[PDB]
Amino acid sequence: DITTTLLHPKGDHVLHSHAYPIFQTSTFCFDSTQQGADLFMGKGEGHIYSRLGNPTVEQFEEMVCSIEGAAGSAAFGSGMGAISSSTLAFLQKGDHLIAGDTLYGCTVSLFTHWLPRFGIEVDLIDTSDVEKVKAAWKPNTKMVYLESPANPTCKVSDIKGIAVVCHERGARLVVDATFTSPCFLKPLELGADIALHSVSKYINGHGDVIGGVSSAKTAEDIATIKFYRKDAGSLMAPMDAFLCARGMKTLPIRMQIHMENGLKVAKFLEQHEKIVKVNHPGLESFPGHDIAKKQMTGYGSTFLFEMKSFEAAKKLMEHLKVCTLAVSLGCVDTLIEHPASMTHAAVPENIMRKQGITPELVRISVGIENVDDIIADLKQALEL
Amino acid sequence: AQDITTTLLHPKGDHVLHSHAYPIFQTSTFCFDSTQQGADLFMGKGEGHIYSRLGNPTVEQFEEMVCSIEGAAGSAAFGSGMGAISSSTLAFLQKGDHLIAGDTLYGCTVSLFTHWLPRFGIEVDLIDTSDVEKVKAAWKPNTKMVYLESPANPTCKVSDIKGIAVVCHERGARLVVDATFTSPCFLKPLELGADIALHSVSKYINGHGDVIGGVSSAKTAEDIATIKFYRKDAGSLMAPMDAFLCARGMKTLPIRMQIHMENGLKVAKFLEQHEKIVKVNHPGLESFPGHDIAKKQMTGYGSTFLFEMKSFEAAKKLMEHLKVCTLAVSLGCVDTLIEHPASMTHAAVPENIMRKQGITPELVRISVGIENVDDIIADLKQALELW
Amino acid sequence: AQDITTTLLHPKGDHVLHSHAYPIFQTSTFCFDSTQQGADLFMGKGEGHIYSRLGNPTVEQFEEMVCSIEGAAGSAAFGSGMGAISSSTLAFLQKGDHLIAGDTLYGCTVSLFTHWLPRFGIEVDLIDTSDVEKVKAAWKPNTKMVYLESPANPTCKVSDIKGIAVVCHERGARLVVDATFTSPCFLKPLELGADIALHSVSKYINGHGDVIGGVSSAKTAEDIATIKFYRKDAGSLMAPMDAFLCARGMKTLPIRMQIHMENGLKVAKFLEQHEKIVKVNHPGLESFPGHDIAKKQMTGYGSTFLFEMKSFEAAKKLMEHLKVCTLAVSLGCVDTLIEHPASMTHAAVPENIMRKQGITPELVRISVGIENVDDIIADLKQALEL
Amino acid sequence: AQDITTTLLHPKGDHVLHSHAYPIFQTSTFCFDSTQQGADLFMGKGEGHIYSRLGNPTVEQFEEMVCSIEGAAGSAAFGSGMGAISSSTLAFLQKGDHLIAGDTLYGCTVSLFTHWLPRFGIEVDLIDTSDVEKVKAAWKPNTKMVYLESPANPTCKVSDIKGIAVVCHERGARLVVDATFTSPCFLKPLELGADIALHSVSKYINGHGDVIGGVSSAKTAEDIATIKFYRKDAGSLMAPMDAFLCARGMKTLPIRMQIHMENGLKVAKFLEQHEKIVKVNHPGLESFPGHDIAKKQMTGYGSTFLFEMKSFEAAKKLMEHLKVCTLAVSLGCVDTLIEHPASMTHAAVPENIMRKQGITPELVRISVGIENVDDIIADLKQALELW
C-alpha cells in the first residue's frame, strides 16, 4: 500500500543518517565559480539558496509527488500560498477563471478581491452540474478551479466530467483536495492538471504546522509554479518540512481511522432527533454520493450538520468536554466550528446565500480518538 | 532616550508562563472560550488568537521588535524577502496603475517587476533613481508607487530617498524602500519620508545564515493592515521556529552591525589601494559617487559591496583561493561571503537591464562578516598575490 | 471508561495563550514576580517555574502523558534511556547495597551494572530472572533492588514480573522494570507490582527514529521526588524540542503499537516455517518458552524479536541483501530495522556473561515497522533465495 | 596567529551537502553499508556514526568549536552543566578515593558533592582553595582530584589555579576547573595546568537564555574518552537542536564577552561609589581580595558579581523596582539578570556551608548583559534612589 512508499522515500542518506536532516540554512557553498554558475543555469546537481531549493523541503515534495502521481511538487508556507501560486502563476490580465461557488473563505477572498484587481475575470458557479460549467464558458476561459467535497458544505463536483471539458477546450483544471487527502482523492488520475492541499490539515495532521503543497501533471507546469514561488516567496520552512514529512509517515493509517470514525459519527448525528440534516459525502442520503463513491477511494472526516436554531448550535458547541471549539480540520483530535461567524464570516452576503451557509450550521472535524468516546461527548452535550 | 541595544533586548509584551525566552508557538490553531469570543476575534473585537496564518504569538513578537526599530505603525513578517516585496507592492498596485522602480535591484526583484507585474496589468518603468529629475520625468498621471533599494544590490548605487519622498508626497504616490543592505540600525526609511520600509531578514537582521524570511513595516496603521490582508491570501508566512531564530539573531544586531560597518570600511580601503583592484564601490568611500547623499541619509553602512578586478580570470582566481571568505550567494552573515554577480545573483537579469546596472564579468561582490578584520585582509592579500 | 487513544489526545492541564498544540518552551530560566514568590518556589510552594533543569512546561506535559498511561504517582523524562536507567537505580542504591539484575539486558545496561555500580561500592549479581526460585536463591541481607527487562533485549526472554514483585514486596526491595520492548500500551509494570517502570523513549513511545530520550515512572510520590532530585544533580534532561517531538509521536502510539504487534506476529510466523530458519524467539508464539507468562502479564507484544540462521555467512547474506529493511541499530521505529547483536548492540558485553545470555554470531534481530506486512515478507523472501 | 573570533566562525570539518550552516541531525540511529562496516564502527574503525547517544554530527560540531578555544585534546557536550560536572568527576572517582573541592560552589554542585558522592564511597572535603596551604593541609594519600570554581558562584572568590595545579601535578591528582563564570574567552584552565575545563553552556557560551547544556574538555585523549564512556552510560546528552543553538550562540561569544566584561566593570564601579552599597565583589576591582591573582591568570572578566546592601529590606526594594534588569536565576544572558542568592540559587545549601561561603540576606547577585551600560546604570540608580 501507500504506507511502505511513504516510509521508504527515494534518495540517498545524508551522512548515513536514518532520519533525514533538517537543513536549517539559507545558503550553500560552491566548489568553484563554474560549478556555482552551472547551477544557476540549471546544469549539474546541487543547491544554491533555500528559496530556490532546500534538501529537507525537497524530500517532503518528493513524498507528496509520489502519492499524487505527478511530474513534480512544490511546498509552500500555507495552503493559501499553494492556491495563489497554482492560479496566478498562469492567469493574467484578460483571462477568465471559472471557480466553484462554494469554497474555503480565504479562497473566496483571493478570487473575489485580488484577482479582479489584476484584470482577471472570475465567475463562481455550481460545479456539481457540468452543463452549468459549459454555459459559463467564454473564449478567454483559461482555468477551472474546484474544491470537492467543498468546505464547509461538502458539495461534490464531477471532477472527471469537468476535466473532459477542460481538455477539449484548452483550459487548466486545478483541484484543492485538502478535505480528502491524497490517500482518497488523486485529481491528476481524474484528468486534473494540478492537485493541491493545505498541508496544515490531514497531510501533517498533528495541528502544529501551516503549509501548502501543489502538484502538477507536467514538468513544465511545476517549473512555472516554482518560478512564481521564487518571486512570490511563500516557502515552507525546513523545520515545518521535517515536521510535515514526519506527520506524513502515519498518513495512510490516520486516514483509515478518520474515514471510519467520520462515517460513524455522521450516522449517529443523522438519526438523532435534535439534528435536522447531515452533510457527509459517504451517506446514501447525501446528493452527490454516487459521484463521490465513483471518483474517490474514501472520505475525509470533516463534515457539516444542521441544528434547529442558533441557540441550540451554541448550546452544543459550548458544552462539549472532548471536542475543542476551534477553526481548522484534519487534526488527530476532534475539532468543531461555526462557519457563519468564523471560517466563512467574511464571505459576501450573496456568496453566503448561494453557498447555503446559515447560523444553524455546525462543522465538525472528527479525529482518531475512540469513536464511542466522541459519540458520548456529543450525546451529553445534545441531551443536556 | 533608551538605546536601541536595550530596546531589542527588552521588547514590549507580557511574558508567557513567566518564561524568560519567548516560547515557540508551533501550532496551527487556537481554542475559543465560547462561540461569541471566537466570533468577536473574527471581527477584530478583543485580544487573542485564531489561526497562525492570521497571527502567531512568536511571529508577532518578532514583528514588534522590528516595528520598534523602524519607528513604524506595525510590521508584518513573511517567509522570505521576496514575500515582503510582493506583499508591499501588489497589496496596493492594481491594473492600470504605474510603478517607478530603481534600475539596479536584486535580481529576483527585477524578475517580479518585469515578468509578473505586467501580467497583472501593472505598468512598470525601471529608472535611474540616483537622479530625482529622471524620476520626475518618468512620472505619469497614474503613477501610484516608487520602489527604491539604496545602496542597490550589487553596485551600491545610492538614491536620494528624501528628495524622491517629497515628490511622492506631493503627487499621491507611496514610497517603498528595501533597506536590506544597510539594516534598520543604519537606515530608517520611515524617518526619511518613505511609507514602507522592508528587509530580507535572511541577511543582517537574522545575521546567522540559517533562516530565509522577510519583514515589511508601514508608517500608517491602514497600510500595515492592508499588507497583512494581502499576506493572509497570498500565504507567505514566517514559520514560528524561524521567528524564534530571527528574534534571537536580532538580539545582537546592533553590535554585529557596528563590527560589520567597521570591518567593511577597512577591507574596502585595503582593496582600494591594492594594485590588482581597479575600483571599489563602497558608499562610505570618499571616491564613491553618492557618498555625500549616503552619509547624510544614513547613520552607518552595511558591509556588502562590490569591487572590479582587471579581468574575469583574475576575479575567478581570487574567489577560488580564499580560505576565510566563503564562495556562496547571500550576505549579511556573521562570516564573510563572496560571489560573482554576472554569473550568480544577477545572471538571470535581462541583458539590457544588466548593462544599465553596469554589471560585468570583472566584478566581485563581498559581504564582510565579523571575523577579525586583519585575518580577512590577510586572506584577500594572499590570494591577490598568488603565483 | 475513556479509552487510551482519547486520553493521550486530550491530556490534562491549561492551554497556553489558547494554543491548541502545546508551545515549545525553549528557555533556560523563568522570571519572578517578587523576591518572596521566587523564594517560595525554591521552597516548593505554590505553583510555577524557576529553571528548566528543575522543570520545563513542555517536558512536564510529556511526563504527564506517560504518567497517565503507566498509572503512576509521577513521571520523569531524561536525555536518554540510559539516563532513566541510571537515575532509577543510583537514585536509591548506595555503597554496601546489593542489586539483582536479569542476566540478559541491553548491552549498555550491562556496562552500567558491570563497570560503574561496583566502582561506587554496589554489589551486582546477574541472574536468570525467568525462574523466581533463582531470584530467591540469589537474595542477600543487603539486597535493596531487583532490575528486570521482559521480554529481554535481544533474545526476548520473559520473566515472571508478578511473582518477582511479590518477593520484592515480601523482602523490602524495589522492583524496577525496563518495558522499552513492549511499550506502555501492552506492558504496565506498575499494575504488576513493580515500583518503577521505565522506557527508552527513543524506541516506540516516540516511534519516529528522530529522538533519543528516556522516561521513568514511580508508584509513590516520594520515589519520583527522589528520582527528580537525582536528575537535578546528575543532569540527564530531555530538551524542550525533544519533549515536543515525543509528545507528538505519542499521539499515535496506540494505533502504531496495534500495527507493530500484528505486523510482527505475521513476520515471525513466516520465519518460523521457512526452511532456512532454525528458530524464532517471539514471545507471542505458542512454541516460545514463557509464552504462557507473557500472555497473562501483557495485553500485547512489541514488534522486535530475534531468529537463528544456519551460519554467520547466511546471517551476513540475509542482512546485506534486503531492499526494504535497513541495516541499523535501535528499534521501534515506523520502518523496519535489522541488526546483528553479537558484533553490534552487544559487542561490548563480556564473553562470560554473553555466553550465558545465549547470544551467538548466528543470531539476527529484526524490528518490524508499520509498513504493509506483505512488502516486508517479500523483502525477506527475496533475500532468502540468493 | 588567527583570532579566536575567526576560528569560531570557521570551524574545521567537511560541509554537508554544501550547506553553509551545519545541518541539524534530528536522528536517533544511522544506517550501515554492510555487516563489516557496522561491526567495525563498534570497534571502532574508522570514520562514521552509529547512534546519537554515542555521537551525533551536529553535537560533534559544537564539541570541536569548544575544543578549539580551550586548547584541549577533545570536548564532550552534555544535557546540562550538572551533566558535565557529574561526568567529569564520577568518570574518575571511585569508592575509597578522596576529592578536595572549593568551599564556595554553585549550590547544585554542593548538592552533588555532599549528598551523592559520599553515598558512592567517595570522601569529600570542601576547602578554602584561595589558600594553597589549606589545600596542601587537606591532602591525603588517597587524594585523586581537586575541583575548583574560580571566581566562585556567587561571591567571586578567587582561587590560585596555577599554584594548586603544581600540587596536583606533583602528587598525581587531576585538577578539574568549572570556568562557567568567566567563559573560555577569558579563562583557559588547560593553559594554567588544569586537566579538565568545563562549563555550563547555559550561561555565556550559548548566551541567549534559551538552552540548558554542559561541556567538558580534557587535556588528554585518554581522559576525554573516559568522560565519553561515562556519558554513554549516564546518558546526559546534548540534543541535536540544542547543539545547533549553542553553536549558533557561540558564533558571537568573543564580541558578547568583550561587551559583558566592560559593562560589568562599569556597573561595579558605579555600585562601589554608591552610598546605598556597602561592598562590591567583582574580581576586576582593585579593592577585591585576589584581584592580583585574577589579573594574572585570566585575560578578562565575566559580568556576574555580587554586592552588599545595608539590609535585606533594601535588597528586596532594589530587586523589585528594576525595569531593565529581570528578577530570575541564571546568568550569562544577553540581557541583565538579578537574583537573591540566600533565598534562591543557594537556598538549599546547608547552613554550615552557607556561612563559610559568606552568603547573607543583604547580598544581591547581578549578571550584567549587553544592553547599553548607561541604561543599566540609570535603571539601578532610579531604584536605589526610591522614596
Ligand SMILES: CSC/C=C(/NCc1c(COP(=O)(O)O)cnc(C)c1O)C(=O)O
Ligand atoms: C482562518 S480559518 C482556518 C482554515 C481552514 N481551512 C484552510 C483551507 C485552505 C487554506 O490553507 P492554509 O492557508 O494552510 O490555512 C485551503 N483549502 C481548504 C479546503 C481549506 O479548508 C478552515 O478551518 O476551514
Ligand SMILES: CSC/C=C(/NCc1c(COP(=O)(O)O)cnc(C)c1O)C(=O)O
Ligand atoms: C539566489 S541569490 C541569494 C539572495 C540575495 N539577496 C536577496 C535579497 C532579497 C530577497 O530576499 P530573500 O527572499 O529573503 O532571499 C531582497 N532584497 C535584497 C536587497 C536582497 O539582496 C543575494 O545574494 O543577493
Ligand SMILES: CSC/C=C(/NCc1c(COP(=O)(O)O)cnc(C)c1O)C(=O)O
Ligand atoms: C548503540 S545501541 C542502540 C540502542 C538499542 N536500545 C537501547 C535500549 C536502552 C537505552 O536507551 P537509549 O539511551 O535511549 O538508547 C534501554 N533499554 C532497552 C531495552 C534498550 O533496547 C538497541 O538497538 O538495542
Ligand SMILES: CSC/C=C(/NCc1c(COP(=O)(O)O)cnc(C)c1O)C(=O)O
Ligand atoms: C536552579 S539555579 C540556576 C543556575 C545557576 N547556575 C548554574 C551553574 C552550573 C550548572 O549548570 P546547568 O546544569 O547548565 O544549570 C554549573 N556551574 C556554575 C558555576 C553555575 O553557575 C545560577 O543561577 O547560579
